[PDB]
Coordinates of N, CA, C and O in Angstrom, one line a residue:
Chain A
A218 N -78.7 -2.7 -6.8 CA -77.8 -2.0 -7.7 C -78.1 -1.5 -8.6 O -79.3 -1.3 -9.5
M219 N -77.5 -0.1 -9.1 CA -78.0 0.7 -10.3 C -77.0 1.6 -11.0 O -75.9 1.6 -10.8
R220 N -77.5 1.0 -12.2 CA -76.4 1.8 -13.1 C -76.7 3.0 -13.9 O -77.8 3.4 -14.0
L221 N -75.6 3.5 -14.3 CA -75.7 4.6 -14.8 C -74.8 4.9 -16.1 O -73.9 4.3 -16.2
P222 N -75.1 6.1 -17.3 CA -74.0 5.9 -18.5 C -72.9 6.8 -18.4 O -72.0 6.3 -19.2
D223 N -72.7 7.5 -17.3 CA -71.8 8.6 -17.2 C -70.4 7.2 -16.2 O -69.4 7.7 -16.2
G224 N -70.5 5.8 -15.7 CA -69.4 5.7 -15.5 C -69.4 5.1 -14.0 O -68.8 4.6 -13.4
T225 N -70.4 5.9 -13.3 CA -70.2 5.5 -11.8 C -71.1 4.9 -11.6 O -72.1 5.1 -11.7
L226 N -71.2 3.8 -10.7 CA -72.1 2.7 -9.9 C -72.3 3.3 -9.1 O -71.6 3.7 -7.8
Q227 N -73.5 3.3 -8.4 CA -74.3 3.5 -7.3 C -74.6 2.6 -6.7 O -76.1 1.9 -7.5
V228 N -73.8 1.4 -6.3 CA -74.4 0.6 -5.5 C -74.7 0.4 -3.9 O -73.5 1.1 -3.3
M229 N -75.3 0.3 -3.3 CA -75.7 -0.5 -1.1 C -75.1 -1.7 -1.2 O -76.0 -2.9 -1.6
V230 N -74.4 -1.4 -0.3 CA -74.0 -3.1 0.3 C -74.3 -2.9 1.8 O -74.3 -1.9 2.8
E231 N -74.5 -4.1 2.7 CA -74.8 -4.3 3.8 C -74.0 -5.9 4.1 O -73.8 -6.3 4.1
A232 N -72.7 -4.8 5.2 CA -72.0 -6.1 6.0 C -72.5 -7.1 6.7 O -72.8 -6.6 7.1
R233 N -72.3 -8.4 6.4 CA -73.2 -9.3 7.6 C -72.0 -9.7 8.3 O -72.5 -9.6 9.3
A234 N -71.3 -10.5 8.1 CA -70.5 -11.3 9.2 C -69.0 -11.2 8.6 O -68.5 -10.9 7.4
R235 N -67.6 -11.3 9.3 CA -66.2 -11.2 9.3 C -65.9 -12.6 8.9 O -66.5 -14.0 9.0
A236 N -64.8 -12.7 7.7 CA -64.5 -14.6 7.2 C -63.4 -14.2 7.3 O -62.6 -13.3 6.7
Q237 N -62.3 -15.5 6.9 CA -61.7 -15.6 6.5 C -60.8 -15.9 5.1 O -61.7 -15.7 4.3
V238 N -59.9 -15.3 3.8 CA -59.3 -15.9 2.9 C -58.5 -16.5 2.7 O -57.4 -16.6 3.8
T239 N -59.1 -17.5 1.9 CA -58.2 -18.6 1.2 C -57.0 -18.6 0.5 O -56.1 -18.8 0.6
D240 N -57.5 -18.3 -0.5 CA -56.3 -17.9 -1.9 C -57.4 -17.0 -3.1 O -58.3 -16.4 -2.8
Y241 N -56.0 -16.3 -3.3 CA -55.7 -15.5 -4.7 C -55.5 -15.9 -6.4 O -55.1 -17.2 -6.3
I242 N -56.8 -16.2 -6.8 CA -56.6 -16.4 -8.6 C -55.8 -15.3 -9.1 O -57.0 -14.1 -8.9
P243 N -55.4 -14.7 -10.0 CA -54.6 -14.1 -11.0 C -56.4 -14.1 -11.9 O -56.7 -14.6 -12.9
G244 N -56.5 -12.6 -11.9 CA -57.4 -11.6 -12.8 C -57.3 -10.8 -13.8 O -56.2 -11.5 -14.4
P245 N -58.3 -10.3 -14.3 CA -59.2 -10.1 -13.8 C -60.8 -11.0 -14.3 O -60.7 -11.4 -15.4
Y246 N -61.6 -11.0 -13.6 CA -62.1 -10.6 -12.1 C -61.0 -11.6 -11.2 O -60.9 -12.6 -11.0
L247 N -61.0 -10.7 -10.3 CA -60.6 -11.5 -9.0 C -61.2 -11.9 -8.1 O -62.2 -11.5 -7.7
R248 N -61.2 -12.9 -7.1 CA -62.4 -14.4 -6.8 C -61.6 -14.8 -5.5 O -60.3 -14.9 -5.7
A249 N -62.1 -14.9 -4.9 CA -61.7 -15.4 -3.4 C -62.5 -16.8 -2.8 O -64.0 -16.1 -3.1
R250 N -62.3 -17.3 -2.0 CA -63.2 -18.5 -0.9 C -62.9 -18.1 0.7 O -61.8 -17.9 0.9
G251 N -64.1 -18.7 1.2 CA -63.8 -18.8 2.8 C -63.9 -20.1 3.2 O -64.8 -21.0 2.8
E252 N -63.2 -20.2 4.0 CA -63.6 -21.7 4.9 C -64.7 -21.6 5.9 O -65.8 -22.8 6.1
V253 N -64.9 -21.4 7.2 CA -65.6 -20.9 7.4 C -66.0 -19.6 8.1 O -65.3 -18.5 7.9
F254 N -67.0 -19.4 8.9 CA -68.0 -17.7 9.1 C -67.1 -17.4 10.9 O -67.3 -18.6 11.0
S255 N -66.3 -16.7 10.5 CA -66.2 -16.2 11.9 C -67.0 -15.6 13.0 O -67.7 -14.2 12.0
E256 N -67.3 -15.8 13.9 CA -68.8 -15.2 14.5 C -67.7 -15.2 16.1 O -67.6 -16.2 16.3
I257 N -68.3 -14.4 17.1 CA -68.4 -14.5 18.4 C -69.2 -14.3 18.8 O -70.4 -13.6 18.6
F258 N -69.5 -15.2 20.6 CA -70.9 -14.6 21.2 C -70.6 -14.3 22.6 O -69.3 -14.4 23.3
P259 N -71.3 -13.5 22.6 CA -70.8 -12.7 24.3 C -71.0 -13.5 25.0 O -71.7 -14.4 25.1
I260 N -70.0 -13.8 25.9 CA -69.6 -14.9 27.9 C -69.8 -13.3 28.7 O -69.0 -12.5 28.5
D261 N -70.3 -13.4 30.1 CA -70.4 -13.1 31.0 C -70.7 -11.7 30.6 O -69.7 -10.5 30.8
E262 N -72.2 -11.1 30.2 CA -72.5 -10.3 29.7 C -72.6 -8.8 30.3 O -73.0 -7.7 29.9
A263 N -72.3 -9.0 31.8 CA -72.3 -8.0 32.8 C -71.5 -7.0 32.4 O -72.1 -5.9 32.0
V264 N -70.3 -7.1 32.4 CA -68.9 -6.5 31.8 C -69.4 -5.8 30.3 O -69.3 -4.7 30.0
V265 N -70.0 -6.2 29.1 CA -70.0 -6.0 28.4 C -71.1 -5.2 27.9 O -71.1 -4.2 27.9
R266 N -72.2 -5.3 29.6 CA -73.2 -4.0 29.0 C -72.4 -3.0 29.8 O -73.1 -1.3 29.4
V267 N -71.6 -2.6 31.0 CA -71.0 -1.8 31.2 C -70.0 -1.0 30.2 O -70.5 0.0 30.5
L268 N -69.6 -2.0 29.4 CA -68.9 -1.6 27.8 C -69.7 -0.4 27.5 O -69.1 0.5 26.7
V269 N -70.6 -1.4 27.3 CA -72.0 -0.6 25.7 C -72.6 0.7 27.1 O -73.2 1.9 25.8
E270 N -72.6 0.4 27.9 CA -73.2 1.7 28.4 C -72.1 3.1 28.7 O -72.8 4.5 28.5
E271 N -71.4 2.6 28.7 CA -70.0 3.6 28.4 C -69.5 4.1 27.2 O -69.7 5.4 26.9
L272 N -69.9 3.3 26.3 CA -69.6 3.5 24.9 C -70.8 4.5 24.5 O -70.7 5.1 23.6
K273 N -72.2 4.0 24.4 CA -73.1 4.9 24.2 C -73.2 6.4 24.8 O -73.8 7.1 24.2
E274 N -72.6 6.6 26.6 CA -72.6 7.8 27.1 C -71.3 8.5 26.0 O -71.4 10.1 25.9
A275 N -70.1 7.5 25.6 CA -69.0 8.1 25.2 C -69.5 9.4 23.9 O -69.3 10.3 23.2
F276 N -70.9 8.2 23.2 CA -70.8 9.0 21.8 C -72.2 9.9 22.3 O -72.2 11.2 21.5
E277 N -72.8 9.7 22.9 CA -73.8 10.8 23.4 C -72.5 12.3 23.9 O -73.5 13.4 23.5
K278 N -72.0 12.2 24.2 CA -70.6 12.8 24.5 C -70.1 13.5 23.4 O -69.5 15.0 23.6
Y279 N -69.9 13.3 22.5 CA -69.3 13.0 21.4 C -69.9 13.6 19.9 O -69.2 14.5 19.1
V280 N -70.9 13.3 20.1 CA -72.4 13.9 18.4 C -72.1 15.4 18.5 O -72.7 16.1 18.0
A281 N -72.4 15.4 19.7 CA -72.4 16.9 20.4 C -71.2 18.4 20.0 O -71.1 18.7 20.4
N282 N -70.1 18.0 19.4 CA -69.1 18.6 19.4 C -68.6 19.1 18.1 O -68.0 20.3 17.6
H283 N -68.9 18.6 16.9 CA -68.8 18.4 15.2 C -69.5 19.5 15.1 O -70.5 19.0 14.5
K284 N -69.2 21.0 15.2 CA -70.6 21.5 14.6 C -70.4 22.0 13.2 O -71.0 21.8 12.6
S285 N -69.3 22.0 12.8 CA -69.2 22.0 11.1 C -68.3 21.0 10.5 O -67.4 21.9 9.6
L286 N -68.2 19.9 10.9 CA -67.1 19.1 10.9 C -68.2 18.0 9.8 O -67.7 16.7 9.5
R287 N -69.4 18.2 9.7 CA -70.2 17.3 9.2 C -70.9 16.3 10.0 O -70.3 15.4 9.2
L288 N -71.2 16.2 10.7 CA -71.4 15.6 11.6 C -73.2 15.4 12.1 O -73.1 16.7 12.2
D289 N -73.7 14.2 11.9 CA -75.1 14.3 12.2 C -75.6 14.2 13.9 O -74.5 13.8 14.1
Chain B
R119 N -89.0 49.0 7.5 CA -89.6 48.3 7.3 C -90.5 47.6 6.7 O -90.8 46.8 6.8
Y120 N -89.4 47.4 5.4 CA -90.1 46.3 4.5 C -89.6 45.3 4.7 O -90.9 44.9 4.4
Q121 N -89.0 44.8 5.9 CA -88.7 43.6 5.8 C -89.1 42.7 7.0 O -87.8 42.1 8.1
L122 N -89.5 44.2 7.7 CA -90.3 43.8 9.1 C -91.2 42.2 9.5 O -91.5 41.6 9.9
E123 N -92.1 42.2 7.8 CA -92.4 41.1 8.1 C -92.2 40.3 7.1 O -92.5 39.2 6.6
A124 N -91.4 40.4 5.8 CA -90.8 39.9 4.5 C -89.8 39.1 4.7 O -89.3 37.7 4.7
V125 N -89.3 39.0 5.9 CA -88.5 37.8 7.0 C -88.8 36.8 7.9 O -88.1 35.9 8.0
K126 N -89.8 37.2 9.0 CA -90.1 36.6 9.3 C -91.4 35.6 8.6 O -91.8 35.7 7.7
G127 N -91.2 33.9 9.2 CA -92.0 33.2 8.7 C -91.1 32.5 7.5 O -92.2 31.7 6.6
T128 N -90.2 32.7 7.2 CA -89.3 32.1 6.0 C -88.3 30.9 6.9 O -87.2 31.7 7.2
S129 N -88.8 30.1 6.4 CA -87.2 28.7 6.6 C -86.3 28.6 5.2 O -86.4 27.4 5.7
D130 N -86.6 29.3 4.7 CA -85.7 28.3 3.2 C -84.6 28.4 3.7 O -83.7 29.9 3.6
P131 N -83.6 28.2 3.3 CA -82.4 27.6 3.8 C -81.5 28.1 2.9 O -80.1 29.5 3.7
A132 N -81.2 27.9 1.6 CA -79.9 28.9 0.9 C -80.5 30.6 0.5 O -79.9 31.2 0.6
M133 N -82.3 30.7 0.4 CA -82.6 32.2 0.4 C -82.0 33.1 2.0 O -81.6 33.9 2.1
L134 N -81.9 32.0 3.2 CA -81.1 32.6 4.8 C -80.3 32.5 4.2 O -79.4 33.2 5.0
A135 N -79.5 31.9 3.6 CA -77.7 32.4 3.8 C -77.6 33.1 2.4 O -76.4 33.7 2.9
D136 N -77.9 33.0 1.5 CA -77.6 34.4 0.8 C -78.2 35.9 1.1 O -77.9 36.5 0.4
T137 N -79.5 35.7 1.9 CA -80.1 37.0 2.0 C -78.7 38.0 2.7 O -78.9 38.8 2.7
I138 N -78.3 37.2 3.9 CA -77.1 38.0 4.7 C -75.7 38.5 4.0 O -75.4 39.3 4.1
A139 N -75.8 37.2 2.6 CA -74.5 37.4 2.4 C -74.3 38.4 1.0 O -73.5 39.2 1.3
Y140 N -75.7 39.1 0.9 CA -75.8 39.9 -0.2 C -76.0 41.3 0.8 O -76.3 42.3 0.6
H141 N -76.5 41.0 2.1 CA -77.1 42.1 2.8 C -75.7 42.2 3.9 O -75.3 43.9 4.3
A142 N -74.3 41.5 3.8 CA -73.3 42.0 4.1 C -72.6 43.2 4.1 O -72.0 42.9 2.5
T143 N -72.4 44.0 4.4 CA -71.7 45.4 3.8 C -70.4 44.9 3.8 O -70.0 45.6 4.7
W144 N -69.8 44.5 2.5 CA -68.3 44.2 2.5 C -68.0 44.5 1.2 O -68.9 45.1 0.2
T145 N -66.8 44.5 0.4 CA -66.5 44.1 -1.0 C -66.5 43.7 -1.9 O -67.2 42.4 -1.0
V146 N -66.9 43.7 -2.9 CA -67.1 42.8 -4.1 C -66.0 41.6 -4.1 O -66.8 40.6 -4.5
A147 N -64.9 41.7 -3.5 CA -64.0 41.0 -3.4 C -64.5 39.6 -2.6 O -64.0 38.1 -2.7
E148 N -64.6 40.6 -1.6 CA -65.0 39.6 -0.1 C -66.2 38.8 -0.8 O -66.8 37.6 -0.1
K149 N -67.6 39.0 -1.6 CA -68.9 38.6 -1.8 C -68.0 37.7 -2.7 O -68.8 36.6 -2.4
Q150 N -67.0 37.6 -3.7 CA -67.1 36.2 -4.4 C -66.3 35.4 -3.8 O -66.2 34.4 -3.9
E151 N -65.3 35.8 -2.4 CA -65.1 35.1 -1.8 C -66.3 33.9 -1.0 O -65.2 33.0 -0.9
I152 N -66.7 34.6 -0.8 CA -68.2 33.9 0.1 C -68.8 33.1 -0.7 O -68.7 31.5 -0.5
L153 N -68.8 33.1 -2.3 CA -69.4 32.7 -3.3 C -68.5 31.8 -3.8 O -69.2 30.3 -4.3
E154 N -67.6 31.6 -3.6 CA -66.2 30.9 -3.4 C -66.7 28.9 -3.0 O -66.5 28.4 -3.6
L155 N -67.1 29.1 -1.6 CA -67.6 28.0 -1.2 C -68.8 27.3 -1.6 O -69.2 28.3 -1.4
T156 N -69.2 26.5 -1.6 CA -70.5 25.9 -1.8 C -70.8 25.8 -0.1 O -71.9 24.1 -0.6
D157 N -70.1 25.0 1.0 CA -70.2 24.4 1.2 C -71.6 25.1 2.6 O -70.9 26.5 3.2
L158 N -72.6 25.0 3.0 CA -73.3 25.9 3.7 C -73.4 26.0 5.1 O -73.7 27.4 5.3
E159 N -73.0 25.0 5.6 CA -72.1 25.3 7.8 C -71.2 26.0 7.2 O -71.5 27.7 8.9
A160 N -70.0 26.4 6.6 CA -68.8 27.6 6.8 C -69.7 28.9 6.8 O -68.8 29.4 7.1
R161 N -69.9 28.8 5.4 CA -70.9 29.8 5.0 C -71.1 30.6 6.5 O -71.3 31.9 6.1
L162 N -72.5 29.7 6.6 CA -73.7 30.5 7.4 C -72.7 31.3 8.8 O -73.0 31.7 9.6
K163 N -71.3 30.0 8.9 CA -70.7 29.9 10.0 C -69.9 32.0 10.1 O -69.9 32.2 11.5
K164 N -69.4 32.1 8.8 CA -68.5 33.3 8.9 C -70.2 34.2 8.8 O -69.5 35.5 9.4
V165 N -71.0 33.7 8.4 CA -72.3 34.8 8.5 C -72.4 35.1 9.9 O -72.3 36.4 10.8
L166 N -72.4 34.5 10.9 CA -72.5 34.7 12.3 C -71.4 35.0 12.9 O -71.6 36.3 13.8
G167 N -70.5 35.0 12.4 CA -68.8 35.6 12.8 C -69.2 37.0 12.6 O -68.9 37.7 13.1
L168 N -69.5 37.5 11.3 CA -69.8 38.8 11.3 C -70.8 39.8 11.4 O -70.5 40.3 11.9
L169 N -72.0 39.1 11.8 CA -72.8 40.0 13.0 C -72.1 40.1 14.0 O -72.4 41.1 14.7
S170 N -71.3 38.9 15.0 CA -70.9 39.1 16.5 C -69.9 40.1 16.0 O -70.0 40.7 16.7
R171 N -69.3 40.1 15.0 CA -68.5 41.5 15.1 C -68.7 42.8 14.9 O -68.2 44.0 15.4
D172 N -70.2 43.1 14.2 CA -70.9 44.2 14.1 C -71.2 44.6 15.2 O -71.4 45.5 15.7
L173 N -71.9 43.7 16.0 CA -72.1 43.6 17.1 C -71.5 44.3 18.6 O -71.3 45.1 19.1
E174 N -70.1 43.7 18.6 CA -68.8 44.1 19.7 C -68.5 45.2 18.8 O -68.1 46.4 19.7
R175 N -68.4 45.5 17.9 CA -67.7 47.1 17.1 C -68.8 48.1 18.0 O -68.4 49.2 17.9
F176 N -70.1 47.3 17.9 CA -71.3 48.9 18.2 C -71.2 48.8 19.4 O -71.3 49.9 20.4
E177 N -71.2 47.5 20.6 CA -71.0 48.2 21.7 C -69.9 48.9 21.8 O -69.6 49.7 23.2
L178 N -68.4 48.5 21.4 CA -67.5 49.7 21.8 C -67.7 51.2 21.6 O -67.5 52.1 22.3
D179 N -68.4 51.3 20.7 CA -68.6 53.0 20.5 C -69.4 53.1 20.9 O -69.4 54.1 21.8
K180 N -70.5 52.5 21.6 CA -71.5 53.1 22.5 C -70.6 53.1 23.6 O -70.8 54.6 23.9
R181 N -70.0 51.7 24.4 CA -69.7 52.4 25.3 C -68.8 53.8 25.2 O -68.9 54.2 26.6
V182 N -67.8 53.9 24.6 CA -66.9 55.0 24.4 C -67.4 56.2 24.6 O -67.3 56.8 25.4
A183 N -69.0 56.4 23.7 CA -69.6 57.0 23.9 C -70.2 58.1 25.1 O -69.8 58.6 25.3
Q184 N -70.7 56.7 25.6 CA -71.2 57.5 26.7 C -70.1 57.7 28.2 O -70.2 58.5 28.4
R185 N -69.2 56.8 28.2 CA -67.9 56.8 29.4 C -67.5 58.5 29.1 O -67.4 59.3 29.7
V186 N -67.1 58.9 27.7 CA -66.5 59.7 27.1 C -67.2 61.4 27.8 O -67.0 62.2 28.0
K187 N -68.8 60.9 27.0 CA -69.5 62.2 27.9 C -69.6 61.8 29.4 O -69.5 63.6 29.4
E188 N -69.1 61.0 30.0 CA -69.6 61.3 31.8 C -68.2 62.3 31.9 O -68.7 63.0 33.3
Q189 N -67.2 61.5 31.3 CA -65.9 62.3 32.5 C -65.6 63.7 31.5 O -65.1 64.2 32.5
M190 N -66.2 64.2 30.6 CA -66.3 65.1 30.1 C -67.1 66.4 31.1 O -66.5 67.3 31.9

């Protein structure tokens, strides 16, 4: 995290996994707690591999279209 | 011919952006309109459009001159 005197906060975050929400407490500031960690593991990976190949081909065919739409 | 070698070997992005912009033979109002937008991609797309327009106008002038001389 980096702090600046102009009121703008420059912070980098990295999402880890999805989770549920139990309850909300009247803030400020708001706080929340999670019951269990929501994770999913691949099963029957052949169809998943086919879908991943299709997704990769679609991304390859789509990344070369936005010439002036600010796309890397 | 002073720009025969003064433009080759140069890859400065802002310089190549505004060099044709001030080389673009149009009105001061159009120059200010070009200066209005600060997005490099759109401005250079406009530059290429102007270049293509000049090219096609030159082609039209050429072809009409030749054919009309021929039919004469």
